[PDB]
């Protein structure tokens, strides 16, 4: 009577699958089992992203998942984690969950159209900066964000929250990443009160 449903997750290490299965087993025990039975399909990260996209299509072909969870890779480069699943298992508009995605360029509902995250992005840490600033007797800020999407959006959020207080950022000094000669910007920031 309870129709079998598959909820899948890709996550590093073999051990993580054990509590994946344990947690999905615990979840159904909280409710009855005469209505729905919960299953799980798991896989582990691998370098070539094309292979991950192919395996994602093969899994959703073989599992017709209700929701897919995506993890971070243990091989640094903390940008290629939700590359394959965001747009491969997104053509059918199926919910996708990420746990550790502190990067914010995935929050725009114009490219992904299906993404839910359990960690706040860096614009919220900019809001935290504002809250710290609110009562500390500091009102003469100098932003030094880097020219990138991970920083430009934070700068825009910081600006739009500050203008609500009728205050302004004096400077928007902004240097490109990678280049290592940046001294004149500090001198520019030096010549102010």
């Amino acid at each position: 009577d309870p129709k079998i449903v598959n909820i899948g997750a890709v996550l590093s290490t073999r051990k993580h699958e054990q509590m994946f299965r344990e947690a999905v087993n615990q979840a159904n025990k909280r409710h009855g089992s005469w209505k729905i039975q919960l299953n799980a399909t798991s896989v582990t990260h691998k370098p070539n992203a094309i292979q991950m996209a192919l395996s994602v299509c093969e899994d959703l072909i073989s599992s017709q998942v209700y929701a897919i969870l995506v993890s971070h890779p243990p091989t640094p480069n903390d940008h290629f984690t939700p590359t394959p699943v965001s747009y491969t298992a997104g053509f059918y508009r199926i919910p996708v969950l990420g746990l550790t995605t502190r990067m914010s360029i995935y929050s725009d509902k114009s490219i992904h159209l299906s993404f839910l995250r359990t960690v706040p992005p860096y614009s919220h840490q900019s809001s935290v900066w504002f809250e710290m600033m609110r009562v500390y007797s500091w009102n003469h800020i100098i932003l030094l964000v880097s020219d990138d999407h991970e920083g430009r959006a934070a700068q825009k959020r910081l600006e739009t929250l500050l203008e609500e207080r009728e205050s302004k950022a004096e400077k928007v000094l902004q240097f490109d990443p990678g280049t290592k000669n940046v001294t004149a910007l500090l001198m520019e920031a030096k010549e102010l009160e």
Partner: antibody, heavy 114, light 110 residues
Amino acid sequence: VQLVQSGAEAKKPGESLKISCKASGYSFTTFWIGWVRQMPGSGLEWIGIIYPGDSDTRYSPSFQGHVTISADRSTSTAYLQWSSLKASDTAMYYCARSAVFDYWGQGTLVTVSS
Amino acid sequence: EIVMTQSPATLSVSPGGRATLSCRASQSVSSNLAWYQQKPGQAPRLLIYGASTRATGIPVRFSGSGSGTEFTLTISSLQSEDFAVYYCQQYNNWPTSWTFGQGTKLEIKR
């Protein structure tokens, strides 16, 4: 789905028995198995519900501390053992399936007569 | 702490007639109630879960309804071959209560 219970039996007062309800229709850890009693002219009364996958058990308020509800991990049989205090509990016990008595067993007629 | 009650007494009915007996709820169970039509000399069969739906493999000659009101039988245009016993139980929260009724047995009219 299927359910087979222990055979009917009669025992003298002041003895402890055991009846094994074995499920061979679904996985042994997917549902909450239980126990109900149907004495002639009384109705249905719950005794105890146990999950064989973790041995978590609960019992009825008006029966607690009178019989044990054990289980296993490979034979997939739940043992409803009684105590010597039973003297007028002759009935036809049944084991539930998914806490809503989905698929009942064949029934175990337990008699306590002199 | 709310024992389900079945009514009215005995409701033996003629062939080609409905069977509607009351299971007036004393508590405020959210949506759960069941009757579990049973035949003496056999095991009770699953008739309704959630007091509004019907399990797979069963026709639609018996049902139920209600969320805050008294969950009642919804049997109509039935035959006389059943003549079964009808208890009524519910599970407001599980597994704690397991409240059961006494059963309004139905005979066969002629």
